[PDB]
Amino acid sequence: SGLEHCVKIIRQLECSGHIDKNFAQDFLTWYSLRATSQEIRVVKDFIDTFIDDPMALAEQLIDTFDDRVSI
């Protein structure tokens, strides 16, 4: 599922150190509970587009979603 895939990549980014623990946890909480269906589609598109570049993915996820994710 979309969530399983999202968790796998987010854990990878955290383990690689491209995102921190707090962002990883906030992001997954947000993605699974608060993200609209349209936002979920955007996350999936980001993940697909940046598949070859985890650092770029991380930076884009932070830039785009940090405000919505962190509270």
Residue numbers in the entry: 620 to 690
Sentences reproduced from the published study:
The Arabidopsis VEL proteins are accessory proteins that interact with PRC2 to nucleate and propagate silencing at the FLOWERING LOCUS C (FLC) locus, enabling early flowering in spring. Here, we report that VEL proteins contain a domain related to an atypical four-helix bundle that engages in spontaneous concentration-dependent head-to-tail polymerization to assemble dynamic biomolecular condensates. The VEL domain adopts a compact globular fold, consisting of four α-helices in a quasi-antiparallel “up-down-up-down” configuration, each of which contributes to the hydrophobic core, as illustrated by VEL1VEL. Mutations blocking polymerization of this VEL domain prevent Polycomb silencing at FLC.
We conclude that the VEL head and tail surfaces are defined largely by three key residues, an isoleucine (VIN3I575 or VEL1I664) and two basic residues (VIN3R554,R556 or VEL1R643,K645), that engage in close hydrophobic or electrostatic interactions, respectively, with partner residues from the apposing complementary surface. The equivalent double mutation of VEL1VEL (RK>AD) also essentially blocks polymerization. Importantly, the RK>AD mutant never forms floaters nor fibers.
